[PDB]
Structures are given as structure tokens and as C-alpha cells.
């Protein structure tokens, strides 16, 4: 019966039935084979632990996120993600539910085909649809116009939508955030002697990326107040008892979203990709793209955005034009609350691909 909304996060895969409250399953996507010899021999140990159990078994495994820069590593691990999710989280048979899968706005062919095709032949769902995560965040925001900033680990996106059409020539994909923000944070925490070099320990880095980071209002002036003796330094406690004091680097890492020169990539900041996508849209429509700037995803939950984003855009944007940046709480589940609204609406049941027609058609027409 009931449809299932499963969002193919790159974080943070999210899963839950069609409405009305919150996702049933959220997990950090990691697959990990055991890197040490067993010695206790027990046995009973699994060939690969998925999350959450692989986050209770850090240091005995080598964690591998299965989706890297929006590309799935292999469908052998992906199928195990799916199987784990449906069976050992949700507790549901795929033949009972038409499913809803998500993708990125711009991703290479045949990554949506091969996925769709394998999931139809392996799990044998009766119907399926694949939605881009940005469109779903507009349904969640309750707007029908605006440029959508969907920023999650490890692919961010910039999609302009106008009532209710999309402009293909203005959609921008940045591979800037968020795993590179994790790797950059790990590179500037080595600068303060905290040797977190290993794959597993990168999850601990991610936890300091969540909790302890903040953003400047202006870089140059926060660098000024950093030179002062004031307490920008916050003390974190580590699982083995160590106390880590980070200060300058604390606001330095998120600023990368406005200056990709910090990471050293040639691409320009969210600031400039916003302006350059807006100034690829037709003259009349630009008026309502301003003030319907909508943020989304988990990596937009740094404290100083959006009012950093606001002040910076307001400096490059035309004078006397009203700019509002829409950023609700809960942005990590924005996409999912989108999907819930979508698959519940009649008549869009008939925009699902059904198994009988798929049997004849195959990967054609999906895209």
C-alpha cells in the first residue's frame, strides 16, 4: 500500500513512510570492513558493518562512505545500504510499497539509469519515481519561485526555479561542500597538533564540524578580533579524554563557502554563483529570484549563515532591491518533508514509473 520516501542523501541517508511527521530512519551511510585480526574468534562477526553499528565499532573497521562526489562507488555496497535500510531499519518488504528515490540536479549519465535499473531488478518495487532534491525543498518551503541552495556532504547545488518552470541554462553544481570542508577542517586541525589522521577519526572531525564551528560577519574584522586575547577558543572533549582548544580555525573553515581560495579551488563562492546564475536568467524574472533565495541541506546549519550570505549578496546585488534569504530550522530534513508532500499528492501517482511498463521500456524514458 503506502508509498515510501527514501532520500538518497550523501550524508545521512534518510528514510520514512509517506507522512506526516518525521523520517523513521536516519544513518551516516558508512560501510566498514574489519581492519584488525580477531582475535577472540567468537565468532559471529559481520563481513561489513553498516551505520549505526559502524559508529559503535570505530577503530576496528575502515569506514567508507558509498557515495563520493555524487558518484556511487559500486552497487555491491549500495545494494547492501538499500537491503539494510528496508529490512533492518524500516522493517518493510519492497513489494508492499511504491518507492520514491532522490538524485542530484546535475549528475553524469548513467548514474540514475544503472541505479533505477538495479533497484527494479533486485528489489522489485511495483512503482518508482526519482526526484531531484532541490525541487522537493521548494515543496517543503511552500514557494513556487526562487533559487534553491541545497548543501549537503558531499555535493552542494544551486537551482533557479520560477513558477513552476526550470531554466536549464542557469542550474549550477558546486562540488565545494561538504566533505572538502571536513578534509579542510582536518588539515587546519593538524596545524594545532591534533593528529586525527585516520579514516575512522574523520567521523570525530565531522562531530567538531557540526557542534564547534561558527561563521564570521566579516573575515577581515574577525581576523582582527582573533589577534586579541578574547576567548574565541572553545574546549572540546575527545572520546579518549583529550581536550582540544580551537579558536581562529573555528571561524576559518566555514568562510570557505565565501572563499574557495582557502581550499585552493578555482571556482567562486556561493555569493558569486548566486549572482552569476541570477544574471543568466531573463530580465523580468530576476525581480522575484531576489527575496526567494532559499537555503537547504545540513551543511547550511552553520550559525553565521544566512546573515553573512545576506550582507555579502546585498553588496553585489543591485541597489534598492529587497533581499530576503529564507532559511527555516530543520533544513537537514527539508528534502524529506518535500518528498512526503509530493508522493502523497494526487494525481502525481501517475507520474510514477510502473513495473509493467518498465518491463517493456527498460532504462529508456526514465530520463
Amino acid at each position: 500500500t503506502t508509498a515510501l520516501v527514501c532520500d538518497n542523501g550523501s550524508g545521512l541517508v534518510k528514510a520514512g513512510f509517506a507522512g506526516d511527521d518525521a523520517p523513521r530512519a536516519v544513518f551516516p551511510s558508512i560501510v566498514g570492513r574489519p581492519r584488525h585480526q580477531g582475535v577472540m574468534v567468537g565468532m559471529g562477526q559481520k563481513d561489513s558493518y553498516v551505520g549505526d553499528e559502524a559508529q559503535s565499532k570505530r577503530g576496528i573497521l575502515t569506514l567508507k562512505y558509498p557515495i563520493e562526489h555524487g558518484i556511487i562507488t559500486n552497487w555491491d555496497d549500495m545494494e547492501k545500504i538499500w537491503h539494510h535500510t528496508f529490512y533492518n531499519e524500516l522493517r518493510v518488504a519492497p513489494e508492499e510499497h511504491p518507492t520514491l528515490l532522490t538524485e542530484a540536479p546535475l549528475n553524469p549519465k548513467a548514474n540514475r539509469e544503472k541505479m533505477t535499473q538495479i533497484m527494479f531488478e533486485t528489489f522489485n518495487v511495483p512503482a518508482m519515481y526519482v526526484a531531484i532534491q532541490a525541487v522537493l525543498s521548494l515543496y517543503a518551503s511552500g514557494r513556487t519561485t526562487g533559487i534553491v541552495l541545497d548543501s549537503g556532504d558531499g555535493v552542494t547545488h544551486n537551482v533557479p526555479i520560477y513558477e513552476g518552470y526550470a531554466l536549464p541554462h542557469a542550474i549550477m553544481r558546486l562540488d565545494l561542500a561538504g566533505r572538502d570542508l571536513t578534509d579542510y577542517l582536518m588539515k587546519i586541525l593538524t596545524e594545532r597538533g591534533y593528529s586525527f589522521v585516520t579514516t575512522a577519526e574523520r567521523e570525530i572531525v565531522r562531530d567538531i564540524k557540526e557542534k564547534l564551528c561558527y561563521v564570521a560577519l566579516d573575515f577581515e574584522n574577525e581576523m582582527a578580533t582573533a589577534a586579541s586575547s578574547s576567548s574565541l577558543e572553545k574546549s572540546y572533549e575527545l572520546p579518549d579524554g583529550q581536550v582540544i582548544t580551537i579558536g581562529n580555525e573555528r571561524f576559518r573553515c566555514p568562510e570557505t563557502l565565501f572563499q574557495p581560495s582557502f581550499i585552493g579551488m578555482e571556482s567562486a563562492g556561493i555569493h558569486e554563483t548566486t549572482y552569476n546564475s541570477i544574471m543568466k536568467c531573463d530580465i523580468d524574472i530576476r525581480k522575484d529570484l531576489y527575496a526567494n533565495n532559499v537555503m537547504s541541506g545540513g551543511t547550511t546549519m552553520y550559525p553565521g549563515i544566512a546573515d553573512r550570505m545576506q550582507k555579502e549578496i546585498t553588496a553585489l546585488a543591485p541597489s534598492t532591491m529587497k533581499i530576503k534569504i529564507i532559511a527555516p530550522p530543520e533544513r537537514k530534513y527539508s528534502v524529506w518533508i518535500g518528498g512526503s508532500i509530493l508522493a502523497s499528492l494526487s494525481t502525481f501517482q501517475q507520474m510514477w514509473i510502473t513495473k509493467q511498463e518498465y518491463d517493456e521500456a527498460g532504462p529508456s524514458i526514465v530520463h
Binding site: 567468537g42 559471529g44 529490512y87 533492518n88 522493517r91 518493510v92 518488504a93
Partner: protein
């Protein structure tokens, strides 16, 4: 021709076939037009031509199947004929009210010495047959009464024992002790289940002994299977044992203050499940206010037609003085039951100097003073016996236990005392009917049948495993022995093989690779796990046809259960999912040597009377497998008799027949399967007295004066039927396939021609008058 159509409410209803094709059997109901649905070939069964007939033996039917057998029982329920012979198996239906004259002593004196089929089926017609086999083949006979709990297996057992101590003489000076003792031992062993309020959680086996003179010499009652786990943990809708609610709702205030007893919600072994009492309106006001727990105040009493906890305590203490139990010894029996309750109130923690060790909680000091006063032990010597592992180097050292092993040791010590307490009560009762020089004996088994619930655990797996071993006994005593009898009576019959359940036996109890051989090995493993035990069943038996995973099941409920939360075993009675939560805990029955040198060493004389280096944990599942295979040796060594008791409704009231639950009791008892193998080369086989009643209506009064042995031999000779199609036996006529239906149309055809053939065979009997006399 009309067939039987599956109906949801009635199970089976009448209906014709008006469109036919593969998996497209369109069935129109009879006398209910319009409701034309479709069926499948395996769900439709043919029906009998005459609807007014009811047959004593069901092998006297023309179209034998499950729907024609459920209709014969539905008609004989309406006509009040509850006792019905199906082949060599007695089928009994519980009426739940007293039927006139069927239990009469004039009825019992009538039946005495009469041959089977000559007299109508009755409970005493099975007990008379298994008394003449004592003089023929001279072998001890085991009466095995099967059926779901609350089906009358104990009340019909008291009718069988009353016939044996009357029809074949007396025997015992006092009969009534055997009858009266059963509700006494059912106080200790009965509990409350989801299926039935009054259910027995033990398998009693009466052994009435006799001698070569054929007179009773006394008896011996034992018991097999006790739900020891029930003491420690109970289900939500279940109680514990029914003696604890008869002690807290029955016993006086000059007994409860002397045993320091409080309300059931204060005791750990009684605060898990249901604490409510079984009482009626009058008894509700009789129970004292201090005995009523907050859950009893909020939700009130439990209702049953028979049970009353305060009422059954008066009939418990009356039955104690009738077996000769002294009131001073009854007070020591109450001190042992109350000592198990204050044993469960002991809570452990960690400490130490040992640093790893186990200690007790602050709240367990007042509870330990009242527990050691009831048990008769010192408090300091019991505190370092629940928390240490005593060993020797011969000095004798003590090594503190873990906290989980302390909680398992306290629970194992509680189950150990109730084990020896249950054996002490049956030893006190067996002493009221002692036996002397024996040879022959008549056993009476009383154990429940396939009882499955919505939530099934370890004890439901022990009941279904015991039912699969008993059903493999029924497949080699009802099907194998019976076809040996067809080849002993000159019938011959080609052997038909049955489907064996031996593959389930070598799954549950297989050596090294069995489920009980992995469950008992899990408890020996350091840090046991329920996830490790569930994955070890699927890792060890990856391919077995009897085993399935929760995701491979189609039932919805099972769809909520996760892979590491349970496993599905397919049984002969159906596919049952068993959850793996607390399976390992229930398989723990470890008897620590320090506790053995404490319970034996008690200062109380009653405890001493009760209890009157290998193997570590000892085994619980293989403790019960030893006592189950020992009872199998007593069944394979004795002559068995098969009684099946069918419950007609869940309300437990007279004149109510549900038709859907009764059908499930025919499918969860092997009845359909035994009545498909047995059909073989002679599906219809009817006795001379049954063929006299069914066909005398087509005969005139004058001709009907003949006896049934002569009437059936003159009607067979008059028709001149072929012996290879119609076999004439000693007391029955055996019909080949399609020839009982052809014989019914002989009798329903040409009356003048049939009366002329009766005249011709009468002439032959006048000529064959002297030939037989020499």
C-alpha cells in the same frame, strides 16, 4: 452435485460449481444466490447426497474429506452425540453441560463386555476395548488423551478411571481418591494462558497398576514438562501458577502476618504479568481489602465459569485433609512457597574489593532477613553463596560471580526449589494409593496439543516439539500398525507411505547441529547474545526446508519482526514463528555447587525432606529432552489408545458451534492427514450393524427381523456382488473406490426386483440348513 464451499464464518457452506477452469472454480452458494465467488481446487471438497444421515463411524461415508467430516460432527452436535468413532480414534466434542443418562451406571453396566460397533460410541467403549486386549495379547495399555487445553481431557479422564474401577471390578478400597486428587495437583500446575483461563502447564501421567488375576493393585501419578520459566517471567495476559493467588487471596491474617506476606505487586516473580484474581460478584466482597492490589482495584476481577481463587482455596484445604496432609505440614508448605517469593526480592550490585565482584543492594537487607527466616538458613552464609563460585585446591576457596550470573543464579535457585516441591506433592499423593505386586497396567496421559498463540516463545517451542514427537508416534501407531492389521485380516492392502516429520526432529534436537545443541552451547559461551543465537540458526542450517526467516513469511505479523528477532519453523500443524528474546535466559538452569551445599544443608526438617565436578551449567533443554525421550520409551513399550477432544466454541457454552475454530482443530491434530492415507484401496468400509440401520428403511418390516450378521450376508449373496470390488469381512464390508456410491443406488432402485432376490436367497438358506450342521 453440490460441493462444500469455504465460507469465512461457517468455515464450509453448501454451494454448486457453475463455471470451471484452472484456479477459477466459480461457486454459487446454495439457497443464497448472488453471492457467487471463486475458489481454488485445494479449497473445494465434494459433499454427501443425503443430508439427513449421521453415521457413528466416519469410514461409513461415501465421500470422505474434511468438510464431510466437519458436517457429520455438526449434525451429531445438533443431535447430541458427542462421542464419535473415526476409524480407531475416538473423537469427543465437549458439550459444556451435563447430557442425561450417558454417564449413568445403568449405561456403564449395559456397555460391559459388548463388542465394538455393536453398541454406539462412548467414552467407556474405548476403555472396554483396552481391557480385552489385556487378555488377548497381554500387553499394558496407554490411554493418550489429546486436544487443546480446556477441552475436557481431565474430566473425560475421570470417566475412564471410574469405568475401569467399576466394570472390571473393584479393586481399590477407596475409589474416589484418584478422582479427588486431580484438582489438588492442578492448583500447583494450572496457570492462565491467552487461549484458556484454566490451563494446565504440566503433563500428568496416571499409571493404574493391576495383576495377573486382573484386579487393581494401586496406582502412581507422575508429571512431565513443567514451565519453570513461568515462575520467573510471565506474559502480559498471563498469570504465574494458581497456588500463589490462592495463598494471597485465600489464607488468613494469622497466616499472612506469620509469613510476612504482602500484596503480589511487591514480589518480583508476581509483578510481571497479571495480578488479578478470578472471582465472582459474591466473592469480590469476601476478599480482604489489604489483599487487593492497585491493578485489581483499577481493573477488577477476572471472570470464568469454573474458577474462583478464594473458592478453590477452600476446596484445596479440604483436599489436603482428604489425602492425609496435616495442617502443621501445610504451614511448612506455605513457608516454602513464600520463601520463593521473598527470594525474588533480592537485588544485586557490583563491588568490591574483588573489584569485580558482585554484592547486594541496600533494599535487599530487610528482604534477606525475611527470606532466610522462611528458608531456615543463616543470612551471611546465603549472601556469600548467591554471590560466589566455590571451588577447591584439595583448601576450599570462594570466587565472586558476575552480576548477570548472580541474577541467573537466584532465578535458578527459585526454579530448583519449585521442582523438588512439585515432586514432593505427587509423592505425598502417591502414598495414598500404594501398589504391591504388579504385572499389567493401564496408563492415562493428559498433555496439551498444538497450542499456538500470536506471540510464541521457548515454552511454546517445547510444546510444539513435544507434539511433533507425539505425532511421529501417532504416525507409526495409527498408520504403520494399522496397515499391518490390514495385512493380518486378509484384506491385503498395498502399502502407502506417509510423510515423515523426522526432518524436524533432526533440526530441533539433532546432535551437534541441532537448535537445542546451539542453545545449550550459547549459555556455555562467555557473554551470551540473542543476536548471536539467532544468526547461528541461519548460519548452521542455511538450507533446510523446514526453516524460514521472518522476511520470507507472508503473514503480516511477521512482517514487523526483524531478522535478529526470531525464526520460523514449519511444523506438521503449521508454520510457527518463535521470537528469540530471553530464549537463552530461559535455557539457564545452572545449579551451583555452593547452593547445593546450602539447600541440602538447611536447618528446617521439611526442606531436608524435600531434598531427600561436572557439568557446569547442566542443561535445561537437554534435561527436558532426556525426560521426553524417557516418556517415549514408555509409549513405544505399551499399547496405546487414541482419544481426541474437540472444543466447539470459545465461549465454553452449550449448543454453540463455530465451524472455523473446530476446523483448525481437525487440521492441527493430523485428522485430515490420517483420513487420506487410510482411504487407500478400500475408502468406505462399514460394519454389519451400520449397514442394517442405513438400509433397513428400504426393507419391509417382516424382512427386517433378521439379525445384522445374517441380513448383510443375505443381501450380499442376493445381489451377488463381486468379491474383488466388494470384500466381505468378519464384521465389516469393505468397498473399493466408487462402489459404495454404486451400492447406494442399488438399494434406491427397483424394490420388486430386490424383494425377489431376498426371496431367492431365503430359499437358499432353507437348503443350507443342514449343511452346516454335522
Amino acid at each position: 452435485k453440490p460441493v462444500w464451499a469455504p465460507h469465512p464464518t461457517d468455515g464450509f457452506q453448501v454451494g454448486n460449481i457453475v463455471d470451471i477452469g484452472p484456479d477459477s472454480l466459480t461457486i454459487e452458494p446454495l439457497n443464497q444466490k448472488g453471492k457467487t465467488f471463486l475458489a481454488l481446487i485445494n479449497q473445494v471438497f465434494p459433499a454427501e447426497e443425503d443430508s439427513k444421515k449421521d453415521v457413528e463411524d466416519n469410514c461409513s461415508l461415501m465421500y470422505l474429506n474434511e468438510a464431510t467430516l466437519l458436517h457429520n460432527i455438526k449434525v451429531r452436535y445438533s443431535k447430541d452425540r458427542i462421542y464419535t468413532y473415526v476409524a480407531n480414534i475416538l473423537i469427543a466434542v465437549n458439550p459444556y453441560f451435563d447430557i442425561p443418562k450417558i454417564y449413568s451406571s445403568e449405561t456403564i453396566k449395559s456397555y460391559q463386555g459388548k463388542s465394538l460397533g455393536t453398541m454406539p460410541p462412548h467414552v467407556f467403549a474405548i476403555a472396554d476395548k483396552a481391557f480385552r486386549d489385556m487378555k488377548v495379547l497381554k500387553l499394558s495399555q496407554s490411554i493418550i488423551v489429546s486436544g487443546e487445553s480446556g477441552a475436557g481431557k481431565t474430566e473425560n479422564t475421570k470417566f475412564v478411571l471410574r469405568y475401569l474401577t467399576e466394570s472390571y471390578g473393584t479393586g481399590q478400597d477407596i475409589d474416589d481418591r484418584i478422582v479427588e486428587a486431580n484438582p489438588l495437583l492442578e492448583a500447583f500446575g494450572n496457570a492462565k494462558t491467552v487461549r484458556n483461563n484454566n490451563s494446565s502447564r504440566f503433563g500428568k501421567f496416571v499409571e493404574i497398576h493391576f495383576n495377573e488375576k486382573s484386579s487393581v493393585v494401586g496406582g502412581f501419578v507422575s508429571h512431565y514438562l513443567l514451565e519453570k520459566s513461568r515462575i520467573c517471567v510471565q506474559g502480559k495476559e498471563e498469570r504465574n501458577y494458581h497456588i500463589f493467588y490462592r495463598l494471597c487471596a485465600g489464607a488468613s491474617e494469622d497466616i499472612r502476618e506469620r509469613l510476612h506476606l504482602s500484596s503480589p505487586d511487591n514480589f518480583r516473580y508476581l509483578n510481571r504479568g497479571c495480578t488479578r484474581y478470578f472471582a465472582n460478584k459474591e466473592t469480590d466482597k469476601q476478599i480482604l481489602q489489604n489483599r487487593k492490589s492497585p491493578e485489581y482495584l483499577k481493573a477488577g476481577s477476572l471472570k470464568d465459569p469454573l474458577l474462583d481463587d478464594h473458592g478453590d482455596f477452600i476446596r484445596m484445604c479440604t483436599a489436603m485433609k482428604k489425602i492425609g496432609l496435616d495442617d502443621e505440614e501445610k504451614l511448612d508448605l506455605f513457608r516454602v512457597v513464600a520463601g520463593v517469593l521473598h527470594l525474588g526480592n533480592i537485588d544485586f550490585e557490583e563491588a568490591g574489593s574483588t573489584s569485580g565482584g558482585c554484592n547486594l543492594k541496600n533494599k535487599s537487607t530487610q528482604a534477606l532477613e525475611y527470606c532466610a527466616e522462611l528458608l531456615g538458613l543463616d543470612q551471611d552464609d546465603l549472601r556469600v553463596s548467591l554471590t560466589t563460585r566455590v571451588m577447591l585446591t584439595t583448601t576450599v576457596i570462594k570466587v565472586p560471580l558476575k552480576v548477570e550470573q548472580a541474577n541467573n543464579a537466584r532465578d535458578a535457585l527459585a526454579k530448583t526449589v519449585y521442582s523438588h516441591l512439585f515432586d514432593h506433592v505427587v509423592n505425598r499423593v502417591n502414598q495414598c494409593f500404594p501398589f504391591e505386586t504388579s504385572s499389567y497396567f493401564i496408563g492415562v496421559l493428559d498433555i496439551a496439543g498444538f497450542e499456538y498463540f500470536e506471540h510464541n516463545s521457548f515454552e511454546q517451542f517445547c510444546i510444539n516439539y513435544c507434539n511433533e514427537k507425539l505425532q511421529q508416534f501417532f504416525n507409526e501407531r495409527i498408520l504403520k500398525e494399522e496397515q499391518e492389521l490390514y495385512q493380518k485380516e486378509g484384506l491385503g492392502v498395498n502399502e502407502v507411505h506417509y510423510v515423515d516429520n523426522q526432518d524436524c526432529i533432526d533440526l530441533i534436537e539433532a546432535r551437534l547441529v541441532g537448535i537445542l545443541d546451539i542453545l545449550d552451547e550459547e549459555n556455555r559461551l562467555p557473554q551470551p547474545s540473542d543476536q548471536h543465537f539467532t544468526s547461528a540458526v541461519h548460519q548452521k542450517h542455511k538450507d533446510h526446508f523446514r526453516l524460514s526467516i521472518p522476511r520470507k513469511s507472508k503473514l503480516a505479523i511477521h512482517r514487523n519482526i526483524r531478522d535478529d528477532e526470531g525464526f520460523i519453523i514449519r511444523h506438521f500443524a503449521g508454520a510457527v514463528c518463535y521470537e528469540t528474546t530471553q530464549f537463552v535466559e530461559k535455557n539457564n538452569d545452572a545449579l551451583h555447587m555452593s547452593l547445593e551445599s546450602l539447600i541440602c544443608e538447611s536447618r528446617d526438617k521439611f526442606i531436608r525432606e524435600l531434598f531427600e565436578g561436572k557439568l557446569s551449567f547442566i542443561s535445561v533443554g537437554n534435561k527436558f529432552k532426556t525426560q521426553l525421550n524417557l516418556l517415549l520409551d514408555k509409549l513405544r513399550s505399551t499399547g496405546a489408545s487414541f482419544i481426541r477432544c474437540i472444543k466447539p466454541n470459545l465461549k465454553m457454552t452449550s449448543h454453540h458451534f463455530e465451524g472455523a475454530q473446530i476446523l483448525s482443530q481437525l487440521q492441527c491434530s493430523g485428522m485430515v492427514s490420517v483420513l487420506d492415507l487410510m482411504q487407500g484401496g478400500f475408502p468406505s468400509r462399514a460394519s454389519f450393524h451400520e449397514l442394517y440401520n442405513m438400509y433397513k428403511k428400504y426393507m419391509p418390516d417382516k424382512l427386517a427381523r433378521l439379525d445384522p450378521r445374517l441380513f448383510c450376508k443375505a443381501l450380499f449373496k442376493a445381489l451377488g456382488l463381486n468379491e474383488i470390488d466388494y470384500k466381505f469381512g468378519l464384521t465389516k464390508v469393505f468397498f473399493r473406490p466408487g462402489k459404495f456410491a454404486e451400492f447406494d443406488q442399488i438399494m434406491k432402485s427397483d424394490p420388486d426386483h430386490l424383494a425377489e432376490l431376498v426371496k431367492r436367497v431365503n430359499h437358499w438358506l432353507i437348503c443350507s440348513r443342514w449343511k452346516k450342521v454335522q
